[model samples]
Target: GRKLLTYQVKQGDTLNSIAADFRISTAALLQANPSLQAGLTAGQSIVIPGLPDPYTIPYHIAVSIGAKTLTLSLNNRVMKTYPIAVGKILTQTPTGEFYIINRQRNPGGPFGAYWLSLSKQHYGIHGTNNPASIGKAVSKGCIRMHNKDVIELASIVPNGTRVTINRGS
Candidate 1:
């Protein structure tokens, strides 16, 4: 649904494992590569839809505190936007460029489905337990999204993906 990139299967690659790494469904990956019906091998290249171009080192997420949204893009092409919750006045979200340094799954509690740790210490983008808080400045400092939306975003983005946060005048 976003940028498409070709990936050569490594020696250990299987259709299912590749799909899992890219956070895409096996069916979705197969749909993008119909010829894959022939099966996978180490040398075979597969098309991964919504996967950012490998050359585009900085697949970006521009977070707008004012708009309460997270805008995702690949190089010059805007990919998608999701409604979000920002930090309150006393705990303002950091406004700067940061990389996604770590990813944790089912972090549980108020962290809905996944956690993408930002390069900035103690700050991250995550899913929220309360959907009603989206589109508002209400988090302690993290950018919060709905569970499914965060999961989708998590799948498409990888560690070291650049994230740029702005106040958005």
Candidate 2:
């Protein structure tokens, strides 16, 4: 068997919290740690399987400003849904279609991770250090997501992937 990452459940730990800490979804955590029953006891160890490489998936993302949500599709099949925070009324985010032109590992800009950069002046989806701001109106004019989620999305969405931003309903 391959060496799989594992975590020991601590006091007051739940599957949801563990998954969140690991930057993974609850369902994925449960699927990885099958030995543990519905209830996890303290000090119990859980397996963390290796995640699939993001580069392996070819997909495009569509975002709706009005709805403040992001949709990930691969081969025209929906893969994931993520809530996002767009710009406010004054600094409203621009609506248009753009392809990821570039990516940076440690894009030491205002944000932590540089997921996608468009031709627009200073607008593109990036990772925020503040996770709580996600799903809220906080960014100046960029799509914001959980740091982990943004990083995951960045890895998966290659350069030239189409990103459509439109007014939400």
Candidate 3:
């Protein structure tokens, strides 16, 4: 018996896959989630054994490229949603899970006020000079937000925050 963390399941996640990711065995996972024996479902929270719950509740960022929005959640609770500009058709934003690796203030030029770089190289969620571009598809693959919105976002999220990007289709 070990401590537990609530893991929100995502599409394509299998019991074995999640167990492997957490460095646990399928037997352990099934023991913790007996109902999961049926299968995994997207958006369901599963109790993961062997991981301690954090002192500070974690923050999660989800980007819906199709909805042109960014959603911030904490401990399975939705906090806020902000309009965003995504990549253009020619340079579609990469859809996957990443984490905020680092941040910069006044990264300059078209990057309006803040830059929260993602685990993916050379990509980030940033503020834009053209605030009108919010809620449109017009970036070179990075997620764009209004200056104040991005600033507020940067103020809250820490390095290593999880970011999940999807088409929302």
Candidate 4:
């Protein structure tokens, strides 16, 4: 019951905000990661006080922009693959590791049926209006998927699922 979830800190995160998001107290967070007293860093790893360790979780998403694919894996075994549209030239998708912070269903307009926000600011995986754009790089820096595919993805993954975006394999 005292397992810990390792979290990678992202830009703009603070002790209070991270504590609030994980539903834990700042004291607990600091207790788990005393080094945090010095302040949070963009790529530092910290542990959430009360959750299962990362390895116990079975799902993770891999977004390969060059391959135009989003692969969902369970314990490192590929479960499903979906084609996705990446950001255009002027707005390349940010490459880094992030977790799903939250989700919204039928967010409306350009976002087809669901929107899963990444820990990174203003970036997310969502359904798109243009079905033809599924394999093209034309989004404004978000991962675009078919409405049905996104809906299914949302159904499967929960908040805190890990997602890593990269330019190539």
Best of the candidates, lDDT: 4
Show where candidate 4 strays beyond 4 Å: 2-4, 10-38, 48-53, 87-95, 106-110
Residue-level lDDT of model 2, residues 41-148, one tens digit each, is 677766545533222435777777766678877888767877776655633444444555456777667676665664233546677777566667655545767767
- Could you tell me the TM-score of candidate 1? 0.58
Query: lDDT for model 1, on a 0 to 1 scale?
Result: 0.67
Candidate 2 vs 4: which has more TM-score: 4
In terms of TM-score, which candidate is strongest?
4
Query: What lDDT does the true structure give each of the candidates?
Result: 0.67, 0.62, 0.67, 0.71
Q: Return model 4's CA RMSD, one decimal.
A: 3.9
Candidate 3 clashes: the total is: 0
Per-residue alpha-carbon lDDT of model 3 for 68-138, expressed as tens digits? 67898778876788877665554354455655544686766776788776644445778877767677657
Task: Evaluate model 4: give its TM-score.
Answer: 0.71
Q: Which of candidates 1 and 2 reaches a greater TM-score?
A: 1
Clashing pairs in 1: none
User: Candidate 2 has which clashing residue pairs, if any?
Assistant: 66-168, 67-168
Q: What is the Cα root-mean-square deviation between model 2 and the actual structure?
A: 16.7
Question: What is the C-alpha lDDT profile of model 4 across 1-169, one tens digit per residue?
Answer: 4345788787767877766556667788899999787668887898876555545556798877766688987787777998876645443555577665556867667767887766555557788778776676575555767888887878776666778877763
- Once fitted onto the true fold, the runs of candidate 3 whose alpha carbons sit more than 4 angstroms away are 1-57, 87-95, 107-110
Q: lDDT tens digits, residues 1-169, model 1? A: 3355566664555666656555667787799997665566766777666655444554677776765678888876767998766655533544445555446768667767887766444557788778776776565556768888887878777765677666666
